[PDB]
Design an enzyme around this catalytic site. Structure first.
Site, PDB file in Angstrom:
ATOM      1  CG  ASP A  63     -39.454 -48.700 -14.758  1.00  0.00           C
ATOM      2  OD1 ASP A  63     -39.724 -49.672 -15.507  1.00  0.00           O
ATOM      3  OD2 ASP A  63     -39.445 -48.757 -13.513  1.00  0.00           O
ATOM      4  CE1 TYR A 155     -36.479 -64.914 -22.925  1.00  0.00           C
ATOM      5  CE2 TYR A 155     -35.765 -62.912 -21.823  1.00  0.00           C
ATOM      6  CZ  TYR A 155     -35.964 -63.630 -22.986  1.00  0.00           C
ATOM      7  OH  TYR A 155     -35.656 -63.036 -24.173  1.00  0.00           O
ATOM      8  CE  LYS A 159     -38.887 -61.784 -24.014  1.00  0.00           C
ATOM      9  NZ  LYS A 159     -39.017 -60.355 -24.383  1.00  0.00           N
TER      10      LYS A 159
HETATM   11  N1  LIG Z   1     -30.642 -61.005 -27.559  1.00  0.00           N
HETATM   12  C1  LIG Z   1     -31.264 -62.140 -27.841  1.00  0.00           C
HETATM   13  O1  LIG Z   1     -30.662 -63.146 -28.235  1.00  0.00           O
HETATM   14  C2  LIG Z   1     -32.772 -62.192 -27.670  1.00  0.00           C
HETATM   15  C3  LIG Z   1     -33.464 -63.358 -28.054  1.00  0.00           C
HETATM   16  C4  LIG Z   1     -34.847 -63.383 -28.008  1.00  0.00           C
HETATM   17  C5  LIG Z   1     -35.524 -62.254 -27.631  1.00  0.00           C
HETATM   18  N2  LIG Z   1     -34.889 -61.180 -27.079  1.00  0.00           N
HETATM   19  C6  LIG Z   1     -35.716 -60.064 -26.503  1.00  0.00           C
HETATM   20  O2  LIG Z   1     -35.514 -58.884 -27.291  1.00  0.00           O
HETATM   21  C7  LIG Z   1     -35.497 -57.702 -26.451  1.00  0.00           C
HETATM   22  C8  LIG Z   1     -34.209 -56.935 -26.660  1.00  0.00           C
HETATM   23  O3  LIG Z   1     -33.104 -57.564 -25.945  1.00  0.00           O
HETATM   24  P1  LIG Z   1     -31.585 -57.174 -26.278  1.00  0.00           P
HETATM   25  O4  LIG Z   1     -30.813 -58.436 -26.483  1.00  0.00           O
HETATM   26  O5  LIG Z   1     -31.494 -56.100 -27.313  1.00  0.00           O
HETATM   27  O6  LIG Z   1     -30.932 -56.566 -24.962  1.00  0.00           O
HETATM   28  P2  LIG Z   1     -31.243 -55.846 -23.593  1.00  0.00           P
HETATM   29  O7  LIG Z   1     -32.325 -56.650 -22.928  1.00  0.00           O
HETATM   30  O8  LIG Z   1     -29.917 -55.601 -22.943  1.00  0.00           O
HETATM   31  O9  LIG Z   1     -31.839 -54.451 -24.112  1.00  0.00           O
HETATM   32  C9  LIG Z   1     -33.172 -54.145 -23.667  1.00  0.00           C
HETATM   33  C10 LIG Z   1     -33.189 -52.757 -23.086  1.00  0.00           C
HETATM   34  O10 LIG Z   1     -34.288 -52.703 -22.149  1.00  0.00           O
HETATM   35  C11 LIG Z   1     -33.926 -51.770 -21.166  1.00  0.00           C
HETATM   36  N3  LIG Z   1     -34.804 -51.977 -20.029  1.00  0.00           N
HETATM   37  C12 LIG Z   1     -34.763 -52.999 -19.110  1.00  0.00           C
HETATM   38  N4  LIG Z   1     -35.696 -52.892 -18.195  1.00  0.00           N
HETATM   39  C13 LIG Z   1     -36.425 -51.765 -18.567  1.00  0.00           C
HETATM   40  C14 LIG Z   1     -37.562 -51.141 -18.018  1.00  0.00           C
HETATM   41  N5  LIG Z   1     -38.188 -51.570 -16.922  1.00  0.00           N
HETATM   42  N6  LIG Z   1     -38.043 -50.044 -18.663  1.00  0.00           N
HETATM   43  C15 LIG Z   1     -37.396 -49.585 -19.745  1.00  0.00           C
HETATM   44  N7  LIG Z   1     -36.324 -50.085 -20.348  1.00  0.00           N
HETATM   45  C16 LIG Z   1     -35.886 -51.190 -19.703  1.00  0.00           C
HETATM   46  C17 LIG Z   1     -32.451 -52.022 -20.894  1.00  0.00           C
HETATM   47  O11 LIG Z   1     -31.830 -50.909 -20.283  1.00  0.00           O
HETATM   48  C18 LIG Z   1     -31.932 -52.307 -22.308  1.00  0.00           C
HETATM   49  O12 LIG Z   1     -31.294 -51.159 -22.868  1.00  0.00           O
HETATM   50  C19 LIG Z   1     -35.804 -58.192 -25.033  1.00  0.00           C
HETATM   51  O13 LIG Z   1     -37.204 -58.131 -24.767  1.00  0.00           O
HETATM   52  C20 LIG Z   1     -35.331 -59.647 -25.081  1.00  0.00           C
HETATM   53  O14 LIG Z   1     -36.011 -60.379 -24.071  1.00  0.00           O
HETATM   54  C21 LIG Z   1     -33.508 -61.121 -27.127  1.00  0.00           C
END
Ligand SMILES: NC(=O)c1ccc[n+]([C@@H]2O[C@H](COP(=O)([O-])OP(=O)(O)OC[C@H]3O[C@@H](n4cnc5c(N)ncnc54)[C@H](O)[C@@H]3O)[C@@H](O)[C@H]2O)c1
Ligand SMILES: NC(=O)c1ccc[n+]([C@@H]2O[C@H](COP(=O)([O-])OP(=O)(O)OC[C@H]3O[C@@H](n4cnc5c(N)ncnc54)[C@H](O)[C@@H]3O)[C@@H](O)[C@H]2O)c1
Ligand SMILES: NC(=O)c1ccc[n+]([C@@H]2O[C@H](COP(=O)([O-])OP(=O)(O)OC[C@H]3O[C@@H](n4cnc5c(N)ncnc54)[C@H](O)[C@@H]3O)[C@@H](O)[C@H]2O)c1
Ligand SMILES: NC(=O)c1ccc[n+]([C@@H]2O[C@H](COP(=O)([O-])OP(=O)(O)OC[C@H]3O[C@@H](n4cnc5c(N)ncnc54)[C@H](O)[C@@H]3O)[C@@H](O)[C@H]2O)c1
Lengths: 260, 260, 260, 260
Positions: A63, A155, A159
């Site tokens: 975490d 969020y 960010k």
């Molecule tokens: N998917 C999109 O369209 C998008 C767009 C812009 C930016 N982002 C950013 O990119 C990143 C990746 O997002 P994603 O879409 O792959 O999916 P996601 O957020 O589902 O995957 C992120 C992972 O973080 C893990 N996680 C959450 N809280 C945690 C913690 N406290 N400690 C450790 N691990 C933790 C989750 O279990 C998950 O596997 C995130 O930071 C998200 O905010 C995503």
């Protein structure tokens, strides 16, 4: 060619979505990759599959809000691979609500995971990187770090914050062979987003196709989800020895969202 | 691997500095490159050397302010290589003066070369790219397109302008498989800059080393000139099939200048 | 109270719309106002009406692209009122076309009026202001100086450019008691815009109301045109002795357009 | 004239510096002002002096991280004056350290005071303002919300975050007669800063004058501290009925710091 050849990459939230693809693609570029997430079972499963494909993979679950556990994942990396050359702060999650109905606890947790989490990572890798006069830190931000969006108080706040941390960190290590950048994707075709498409389809009584094409992509000039492959490809460039003059930037890959 | 394999790249101002390196490095990535500049003699000499190294190079000299000559260089490219996949609007120059002593003619010429020149290029390649539903336009801007600098009324005005043109162009072709970005370097180790270091050394009666380290790099966190190789490497990424979701961006490689 | 009491304000394009309101409202705040535009007949008519209301008004018509005529309007101001304390570079116009059908001449003219025009004004008032160690320069830009919009190649290029000129000018006079800012309105209820609403209503066979509410205000969070009164009120603040620490800024009044 | 005539202004951190001046100047413009801070003794003393000068002042002390106490200060305001028309989220503090020596607890507290504090304020005033279809929220940010500065990991992260919260909040209430802006001062002549000048003078064995003129003002084009009066004057404009079309903005008053 192998753009990350025997570099050591530690990636938070790397058990699914963008972090999983980054881990996979970094391995194909010769990185030694550390799979780190909440789900310690997916982490072993992930790293075990990369090992079976002949890759160098370590499971170091934690975490990112738990500074003791994050510090020990970093030490296990040092013990296993000798160093950390690349940190990807990717761990995150989403809660969409109007501010009036936005629980303060949840606001605080989005900020703790996605801002304080990145700060913990950076605090603990900066010593290792400054000693070797080399590193690459990429904070996975979003266009929501550069613009507003109704319902995303926590969020967008988190960010926006991680872009500020990015610039401060970049200035503190600009002489030390270390870059600190925030990669800012738009909408990516991820478990995260296909869920939010399902969500919008139910609530508005429309098809998944309309939900995607008329709501989510309404403000995307290219009218398409980005692939995890595309984010990973930019991450490789920014994480590579070729990008040593890129630092303190919000680096945007958003199909033109922020150009209007 | 050859990231630009049989793509056709037209590069303005490509007889020296950043454009020459971009031409050379694009060729190494499998591009067919068009050398274009004022000096038609350096252009043949350039393309002739690339041909002797086994590269596909065309000399198509033109003044980018001369829309008839720019349009004919584009037609000669189409005739020679079948298409234009990549346009780099790189042609430029500098005049530093306080606004009161800044000749209006010279203001207008900086803008005509570095803004109107890019608009001419784009107007004439957009048809070719829209027909094939593919292209990459990179406008060589500068951090001086994103910030102010005393004495650079015309330059900063023109570079600010080309970022505006970049966003407008990106929105007009976002559905057509075409990206339009502005690459914004900081100080690059170029003939241009070593001249300006010589300039400052004479006028302030200091060594070239002090002129560089105390004046030019005063506001660069990394305290170094970027190499043309570094700009070229970012240009390759942005010009590649891998960067299709990057559009309407001021893409910054400035050793952290704009992070403070 | 009279926030601009016996200040001398020279306003380009001040025979209609935002410039006319700025002239009127500056006069109510105790300014001596110079009405300047192409239409020399509206200019005398304007200044003559302000005089009948007990205001200090001079008609000094000029084409801002005509540096001889702009310089002589500035000299007539000095002769008449003793100085120029405030310059508003407001003169402008619009041509909307896709880049492929965007005449290069018209691109160049938008840039000449709205960038080169501001540079001419500034070049000729900076001496007067630096001598007195006081002034206020406001360049009427637009959100289209900060974002892209399809069809506005020349406008967005020129407005982006004038923000660059603003920052350069601000840095050159930061010690001289002089501020240089770009006021960036969104959609304002002006002759200009009601025409463009009429335009869109004909071409799309919709009512003026739909044309306004569904097209123009589609991307305005506040879903309303700003009043010329609102732009004028911000101009008064920025032009006042109270705003001496505001300089080199793109100052935005856009009902939230650029926040998303 | 009284630009805030019988408006109700709630100002956090208003027992010293920028918040105290804002409270004083808002009262002179006809506001009813709520003095709120940690020091409940300075709060009564403040409000008591404003009452003796014939002003409408309420002491409503609270720690902005204490949502129960912040919510009750807002209710006491409603009870006393009938409404809240204006919220200024001003409460803050500073801790400068390299990231490696930056206690995580202190990082978290800077963010809790200056981001979560603003979110609490906004969550609790948005109902009151939406009911009356009027309000003004100003989040006291900083240029450090828009740029990096070495040693300010927590501050720059929190200020960057509050600009993100500003844009999200602005979009949620753009139809409700409510504006949400972040006022971004540069260096202001405050107890805060004269302390930091004293700090730098001791540690570098230089005079207060050198500490100010050579370190703090090194990157300020105007080479001066802003007065609290100047910040207050911009706050009055943004808080006034005249600024209804300004929303979702980082509004900068920095003597040109961010223009370079
Ligand atoms: N998917 C999109 O369209 C998008 C767009 C812009 C930016 N982002 C950013 O990119 C990143 C990746 O997002 P994603 O879409 O792959 O999916 P996601 O957020 O589902 O995957 C992120 C992972 O973080 C893990 N996680 C959450 N809280 C945690 C913690 N406290 N400690 C450790 N691990 C933790 C989750 O279990 C998950 O596997 C995130 O930071 C998200 O905010 C995503
Ligand atoms: N060198 C730096 O530090 C730096 C920094 C930021 C951005 N830039 C930008 O990158 C680009 C490349 O600059 P550079 O340093 O390689 O050097 P340069 O400007 O000397 O090279 C540019 C080339 O443009 C050519 N040229 C000039 N006017 C022309 C015209 N009207 N038509 C055709 N060709 C013309 C010149 O002959 C020259 O060979 C320029 O646009 C410059 O503004 C340079
Ligand atoms: N109206 C809007 O919604 C809006 C939005 C953003 C910014 N702006 C900008 O604000 C300014 C004012 O525009 P407006 O809407 O009041 O209308 P407008 O453009 O009709 O009025 C501008 C005036 O400039 C004059 N003019 C044009 N070319 C000139 C030249 N070469 N020399 C001298 N005068 C000349 C015109 O005769 C006119 O009276 C312009 O710069 C415009 O680009 C307008
Ligand atoms: N002074 C500058 O140069 C400058 C520059 C940019 C922005 N700012 C910002 O402007 C604001 C005002 O700063 P200032 O210089 O007047 O001084 P300051 O920070 O000393 O005053 C702020 C007040 O906030 C109070 N406070 C602190 N924590 C609190 C909490 N948890 N709850 C309630 N009150 C609390 C303090 O007691 C103090 O009276 C701050 O947000 C600061 O970050 C200041």
């Amino acid at each position: 060619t192998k753009l990350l050849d025997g570099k050591v990459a530690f990636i938070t939230g790397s058990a699914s979505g963008i972090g999983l693809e980054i881990a996979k693609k970094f391995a194909q570029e010769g990185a030694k990759v550390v799979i780190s997430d909440m789900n310690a079972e997916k982490c072993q499963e992930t790293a075990n599959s990369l090992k079976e494909q002949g890759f160098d993979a370590l499971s170091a679950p934690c975490d990112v809000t738990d500074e003791d556990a994050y510090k020990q994942a970093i030490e296990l990396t040092q013990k296993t691979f000798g160093t950390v050359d690349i940190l990807i702060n990717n761990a995150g999650f989403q809660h969409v609500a109007p501010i009036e109905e936005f629980p303060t606890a949840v606001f605080q947790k989005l900020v703790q995971v996605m801002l304080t989490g990145a700060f913990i990572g950076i605090k603990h890798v900066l010593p290792i990187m400054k000693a070797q006069k080399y590193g690459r830190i990429i904070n996975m931000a979003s266009i929501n770090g550069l613009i507003g969006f109704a319902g995303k108080a926590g969020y967008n706040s988190a960010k926006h914050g991680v872009i500020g941390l990015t610039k401060v960190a970049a200035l503190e290590c600009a002489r030390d062979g270390i870059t600190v950048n925030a990669l800012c994707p738009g909408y990516v075709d991820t478990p995260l987003v296909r869920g939010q498409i399902a969500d919008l389809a139910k609530t508005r009584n429309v098809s998944l196709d309309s939900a995607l094409e008329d709501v989510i992509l309404a403000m995307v000039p290219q009218k398409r989800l980005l692939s995890v492959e595309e984010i990973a490809d930019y991450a490789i460039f920014l994480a590579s020895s070729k990008a040593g003059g890129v630092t303190g930037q919000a680096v945007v890959m958003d199909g033109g969202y922020t150009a209007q």
